[PDB]
Amino acid sequence: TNLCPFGEVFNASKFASVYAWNRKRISNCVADYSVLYNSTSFSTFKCYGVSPTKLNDLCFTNVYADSFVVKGDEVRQIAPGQTGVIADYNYKLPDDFTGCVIAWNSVKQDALTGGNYGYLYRLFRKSKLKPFERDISTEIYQAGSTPCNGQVGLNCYYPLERYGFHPTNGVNYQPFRVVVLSFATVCG
């Protein structure tokens, strides 16, 4: 009846920083689930709870999709049950995930010679993130036993740090765009 706008989520030119990861809610529509396989660009494309072929022949109650940018050493933490700054303090997936994490290298776009620092991540938090939680608080981290007074100093750090994306990193430290497809009106 209606087509699911997954392209404008994959085809978008600008992405969110991983700490403020985007989420678009796809419902009451129908789209192709194999237009995401013979793309042969996705370095990573692993469903952790479902199967690409079956999806077409199953209808779903809710298809959510999240989009963000992380470094290559960290797309491994966009997987169920892992620990790391990104998965603990920026984007957490549940242990009962039924879905699919799709990624690819974006040096072409997100790396600029001499610096590209637009993308952020949250280095410190007071606790870990409940699954699918989003924390966007630019509030000072009290690492010490000394209060910070909204002022940076000894054992008091600003929580966001900046990704430096250069086009001569290792695949190690290069930018990467991720999409996390989450899962009775969205058919196929």
Closer residue to other proteins, CB minimum distance, 93 or 107 = 107
In whole angstroms, give the CA distance from residue 165 to residue 71.
8
In whole angstroms, give the CA distance from residue 15 to residue 30.
24
Residue 173 interacts with other proteins (CB under 8 A)? Answer: yes
Reduced to 3 states (helix: H, G, I; strand: E, B; else coil), residue 182 is strand
Residue 104 interacts with other proteins (CB under 8 A)? Answer: no
Closer residue to other proteins, CB minimum distance, 127 or 145 = 145
In whole angstroms, give the CA distance from residue 81 to residue 33.
25
Sorted by sequence, the CB contacts under 8 Å of residue 1 that are 6+ apart come out as 28, 29, 30
Instruction: Give the interface size with other proteins as a residue count (CB under 8 A).
Output: 18
Among 157, 185, 187, 188, binds other proteins (CB under 8 A): 157
Residue 154 interacts with other proteins (CB under 8 A)? Answer: yes
121 CB neighbour count, 10 Å cutoff: 23
Residue 161 interacts with other proteins (CB under 8 A)? Answer: yes
Residue 168 interacts with other proteins (CB under 8 A)? Answer: yes
* CA nearest neighbour of 119 among 179, 41, 177, 43: 177
Residue 52 interacts with other proteins (CB under 8 A)? Answer: no
Q: CA angle, 11 as apex, 93 and 102 as ends, to 5°?
A: 30
Contact mark string toward other proteins, 109..148, x via CB under 8 A:
-----x--------xx------------------xxx---
Longest dimension (CA), the chain: 60
Scanning 24-32, 43-51, 94-102, 157-165 for contacts with other proteins by CB under 8 A, the matching segment is 157-165
Do 102 and 36 contact (CB within 8 A), yes or no?
A: yes
Among 13, 95, 172, 184, binds other proteins (CB under 8 A): 172
Closer residue to other proteins, CB minimum distance, 45 or 124 = 124
Report the interface residues with other proteins, using CB under 8 A. Answer: 114, 123-124, 143-145, 154-155, 157, 161, 164, 166, 168-173
